[PDB]
Design an enzyme around this catalytic site. Structure first.
Site, PDB file in Angstrom:
ATOM      1  N   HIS A  53       0.834  -1.201   0.000  1.00 36.18           N
ATOM      2  CA  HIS A  53       0.000   0.000   0.000  1.00 36.18           C
ATOM      3  C   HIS A  53       0.872   1.255   0.000  1.00 36.18           C
ATOM      4  O   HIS A  53       2.000   1.246   0.498  1.00 36.18           O
ATOM      5  CB  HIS A  53      -0.923   0.008   1.226  1.00 36.18           C
ATOM      6  CG  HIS A  53      -2.008  -1.025   1.168  1.00 36.18           C
ATOM      7  ND1 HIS A  53      -1.909  -2.246   1.801  1.00 36.18           N
ATOM      8  CD2 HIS A  53      -3.211  -1.019   0.544  1.00 36.18           C
ATOM      9  CE1 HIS A  53      -3.002  -2.950   1.564  1.00 36.18           C
ATOM     10  NE2 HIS A  53      -3.809  -2.226   0.807  1.00 36.18           N
ATOM     11  N   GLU A  55       0.807   3.764   1.735  1.00 34.03           N
ATOM     12  CA  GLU A  55       1.223   4.013   3.113  1.00 34.03           C
ATOM     13  C   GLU A  55       2.497   3.245   3.464  1.00 34.03           C
ATOM     14  O   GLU A  55       3.402   3.790   4.106  1.00 34.03           O
ATOM     15  CB  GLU A  55       0.096   3.629   4.075  1.00 34.03           C
ATOM     16  CG  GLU A  55      -1.092   4.593   4.100  1.00 34.03           C
ATOM     17  CD  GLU A  55      -2.078   4.397   2.957  1.00 34.03           C
ATOM     18  OE1 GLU A  55      -1.929   3.422   2.179  1.00 34.03           O
ATOM     19  OE2 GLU A  55      -3.011   5.233   2.851  1.00 34.03           O
ATOM     20  N   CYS A  84      -6.769   2.107   4.525  1.00 37.12           N
ATOM     21  CA  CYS A  84      -7.494   0.868   4.792  1.00 37.12           C
ATOM     22  C   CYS A  84      -7.198   0.354   6.209  1.00 37.12           C
ATOM     23  O   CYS A  84      -6.240   0.787   6.864  1.00 37.12           O
ATOM     24  CB  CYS A  84      -7.103  -0.197   3.758  1.00 37.12           C
ATOM     25  SG  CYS A  84      -5.548  -1.036   4.186  1.00 37.12           S
ATOM     26  N   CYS A  87      -3.556  -0.838   6.616  1.00 34.49           N
ATOM     27  CA  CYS A  87      -2.833   0.414   6.448  1.00 34.49           C
ATOM     28  C   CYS A  87      -2.841   1.233   7.751  1.00 34.49           C
ATOM     29  O   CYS A  87      -1.786   1.528   8.331  1.00 34.49           O
ATOM     30  CB  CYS A  87      -3.471   1.198   5.279  1.00 34.49           C
ATOM     31  SG  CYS A  87      -3.951   0.221   3.735  1.00 34.49           S
TER      32      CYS A  87
END
EC number: 3.5.4.38
Length: 177
Positions: A53, A55, A84, A87
């Site tokens: 991700h 992130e 998410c 995340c």
């Protein structure tokens, strides 16, 4: 590992807060960072990550190449999607362990589903001291001017940008309060 700027068509395509854009599976993260080492001049960094991700891309780059002792950090993320649940959990734990990092997250959209786990992810992030906010007109214009190859053209907001901010900010304050 971070790009300096994104293409203008990509920006308008991924940072819209309208329902259409809820089909966008990519997650874009723009960041600004003030690096404040003790008894030194502040330095600045900015860049762009896309989704590992987006992130995790930021934190991996941050931890391996940037983080240093005796240094405070002021970081702002501008994200197309809110973090998410997983995340958000990683970021929350990262911040718990690096009290010298201060993070503000502004997001264009919240979540594809209104799941309990996503809500708890944000609450938990907020609990660990991150500021979580929706992106408004001013933040989209900042990103256009600073993270996009805007080619000197003014930012043109899309129909419904401000109405959808109100709706998202309403949902977000119900999550966080």
């Amino acid at each position: 590992n971070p790009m300096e700027a994104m293409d203008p068509h990509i920006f308008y395509f991924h940072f819209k807060n309208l329902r259409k854009a809820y089909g966008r599976n990519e997650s874009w993260l723009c960041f600004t960072m003030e690096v404040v080492k003790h008894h030194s001049p502040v330095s600045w960094k900015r860049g762009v990550f896309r989704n590992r991700h987006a992130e995790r891309c930021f934190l991996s780059w941050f931890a391996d190449d940037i983080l240093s002792p005796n240094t405070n950090y002021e970081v702002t993320w501008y994200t197309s999607w809110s973090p998410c649940p997983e995340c958000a959990g990683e970021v929350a734990e990262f911040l718990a362990r690096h009290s010298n990092v201060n993070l503000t997250i502004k997001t264009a959209r919240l979540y594809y589903f209104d799941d309990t786990d996503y809500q708890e992810g944000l609450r938990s992030l907020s609990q660990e001291g991150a500021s979580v906010e929706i992106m408004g007109y001013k933040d989209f214009k900042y990103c256009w001017e600073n993270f996009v190859y805007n080619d000197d053209e003014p930012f043109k907001p899309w129909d419904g940008l401000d109405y959808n901010f109100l709706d998202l900010d309403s949902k977000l304050q119900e999550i966080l309060e």
